[PDB]
């Protein structure tokens, strides 16, 4: 409904928060409301000693309902995947929003305390705009607007409904765990509670002292876990990569993917006949699934209207943002392999100028073309759909930055679009090396 | 056994940590070992979304065993009483150890994230000296040394024993809750789970939106809760003080102490015939009890040898530190109404120089005199035994600072003793006013 006045933002995490600030900066909307199931903003940067109560093993359904921990004495808690000693894998020179720097003397790859404090400070001015401890149940286009159904998170809260001209989903994509359905795993898991875990459950490494562990995966979660487990777990630590690996030392034994778990002998069979036994813990660091747990959106199955299928990505989103069929529905934060805060801010700035009419999206067919060209380049690798590994991310943000400058009319105060110059790009290109040197590794 | 070589430190919180650094700085001990049940150091500055599982109501037994939250997927968690939005009530100019300042741009009364990060940085170099996830079961003088019995915190850990020449208990005193045994309370509590809470269970204020609450107490926990509940709880918030209070506005109603809870009408009777009804939450902000949960120490009942009785304080500790009967047993962190970090450091510096022989304690009778004079001044108010409200704390720390200077011989590197000059004392005297202005209150 072009003239947009009332906007609903689903999620008060880093993406939702920056989206709110960008929208409010347009000085064109009458109502900007954020919905958050947690008692506080900041998304995953809400460290919780509390673990998810029921980890589905295996896990391939991207719809899976998130079950918070409830009690008569506390507000419902939604566990965050952050672990106790976590430090960022993104340097301070790049990871913050462009209009809020880190205090002087911050470590280049700070502890999560620093980022949680950063988010706390960022969210402060937006608290009166957020409906905290409120779980959005569903979203759907009814009549000429969007109807978002939500229920206060507390026991006994009534189910409510409100309508908006636009809805920005910033619900995050690191909540629903992804554990491949291997033959025998389920049984192997239910026979010994605690024998099979997912990275989202890791908190304190002292739990693994003396234990023989198998880390399954080969990305940041896997490599980080292997590192944190090295000084405590029984040597060597095993790591199952898809296509094996080369590292075969005393403390680390990279092996090929898993074929099946033998529940009786509790043996683990790896592609290539390789067999493992006496594994105390199997920790799945296999990532997550994208999720759109909203009935009216999840039922959409047709190629032209669907949003989610296998959870490898969110479909039909021009520039990973605007729902092609109806641009009054957008997403912020879907990007993979990026520096989160700056990337979501880049999208937010663009999103705001488009919903306030100060910018126009290309035609619908041209948007669909953009998608067709993307799918083609993916070569069937749909889980790479939202991946913007450098230099894609730098190009992407600078593209949005330049598009935003075209907005008219010019406002007295223009919400900033980040831009990565030669200096920034360089850091982003050697990011993992700069990180390795910081933690004295590799 | 005068020549002390092996020291055991119970607790790896702010007190235990500074005790360790002071001891190691004497370069006179062969072994300094810290025991900590939590998976990490920092004591209460380990924010836990997890609540204590079983809150005893009422609670007057200072022996009460602390039951951590266990699961097959995680290390046992010992809940900390810190709440989500907590900020310090001690200014940065005074609260840190004298040899570790806060980063520039830190708020005068920072969020707990800052303090948790501060403690993380402080504890780092001591990790190899700490036995993490290890619960000390008991402590006792057998033969010529102390035998500390401990059990790894994980399921299946074996009970172990080690002997030391000295033991420093830094187990903290804000764990065992204190809830007076009011008539009817127990029943009133068990009939409606969640109706009666203790400040140690407070985490997120959104749980109380729309609820009618009764805050019981009149110190920092009570005043802070009332403040945090004001913008969400049903107006007015009731506060039961011992002797009533004067504030009787729209949002706050101070009333006198409680006489009994009527389980049937669920009414609350306050001294003076005043009666309350329809109270959804009763939150006890009545403090904690001191605790020495070690069998061989708790059985000690005689006036000359006892350590704990009603939990109002720890008995027979010269200068609140050295166990008079046997100075090889000491305590750090017992002080009440002080700025914790500096005060424990002051004790630690003194403690180290005494256990390394570089300082001598006065005679046993003179120590007992010190105690007799203290008890006399208390006028039967035993829970004020360890209270060092300004100017007592300033005097105390400066006394220890000056005593420590007498140590001989002088070492190349002398672990520092904090000292509060005119400038520091002034801040400490107007501390609560400086705080009130900071949070724009009172
Ligand atoms: C273990 C781990 C480590 C990481 N380390 C880094 C790092 O070092 N650096 C970095 O830049 N990024 C890191 N990230 C990435 C992280 O995703 C981002 O920093 C940041 O959380 C981006 O958040 P968002 O708002 O998009 O998502 P989220 O932070 O996931 O926030 C989504 C929010 O929306 C809420 N929500 C969802 N659905 C609903 C609903 N239906 N109703 C109400 N509320 C809802 C959630 O409860 C949550 O608060 C890490 C992620 C993980 C999992
Ligand atoms: C809600 C709240 C707010 C506070 N706010 C402030 C503030 O703003 N500023 C300030 O200066 N102080 C504040 N304090 C005070 C706080 O006590 C100190 O900052 C600090 O925790 C001093 O700690 P410690 O080492 O003496 O005790 P603790 O921090 O309690 O640490 C004791 C440690 O020993 C461990 N332990 C105990 N018994 C055993 C055992 N048998 N075996 C193994 N491990 C054991 C514990 O698990 C714990 O880690 C606050 C306290 C509370 C409860
Ligand atoms: N220090 C920090 O701050 C940390 C940050 N993170 C962040 O958390 C987010 C999620 O990270 P992570 O959980 O690693 O997610 P990813 O999705 O990157 O990890 C999934 C990885 O597991 C691999 N995998 C999938 N199935 C198998 C299998 N059957 N056998 C072996 N490997 C398999 C994948 O292989 P393939 O590549 O072939 O698809 C991929 O490498 C990221 O943004 C990351 O940057 C995570 C940990 C720590
Ligand atoms: N913002 C922060 O950082 C916060 C810090 N804290 C810290 O936590 C520690 C513990 O604080 P807190 O829990 O307040 O502990 P305190 O022991 O100071 O509080 C106990 C208080 O409750 C009162 N009380 C006891 N029984 C009753 C009763 N039956 N009716 C009414 N009042 C009663 C006491 O009265 P009386 O004085 O007569 O004995 C006393 O004022 C402190 O070091 C404090 O500084 C706590 C909250 C917040």
Swiss-Prot record, chains A, B:
Please tell me which top-level EC class this enzyme sits in. Answer: oxidoreductase
Question: What is the required cofactor set for this protein?
Answer: FAD
Stored InterPro entries: FAD/NAD-bd_sf (IPR036188), Flavin_mOase (IPR000960), Flavin_mOase-like (IPR020946), FMO-like (IPR050346)
| Single GO MF descriptor | N,N-dimethylaniline monooxygenase activity
The reply on keyword NADP is: yes
> Could you tell me the keywords of this UniProt record?
FAD, Flavoprotein, Monooxygenase, NADP, Oxidoreductase
Mention any one GO cellular component term assigned to this protein in its UniProt record: endoplasmic reticulum membrane
Give me the residues that bind FAD, please: 11-15, 36, 44-45, 89-90, 135-136
- Positions bound to NADP(+): 88-89, 221-224
Q: Name one GO biological process term.
A: cellular detoxification
Source organism's superkingdom?
Eukaryota
Per the UniProt entry, the Enzyme Commission number(s) are: 1.14.13.-
Which Pfam families does this chain map to?
Answer: FMO-like (PF00743), NAD_binding_8 (PF13450)
Give the protein's function: Flavin-dependent oxidation of thiol-containing compounds. Probably required for the correct folding of disulfide-bonded proteins.
Q: How does it assemble?
A: Monomer.
The family note in this entry says:
Belongs to the FMO family.
Enumerate the PANTHER family for this protein.
DIMETHYLANILINE MONOOXYGENASE
Q: What is this protein called?
A: Thiol-specific monooxygenase
Q: Which organism is it from?
A: Schizosaccharomyces pombe (strain 972 / ATCC 24843)
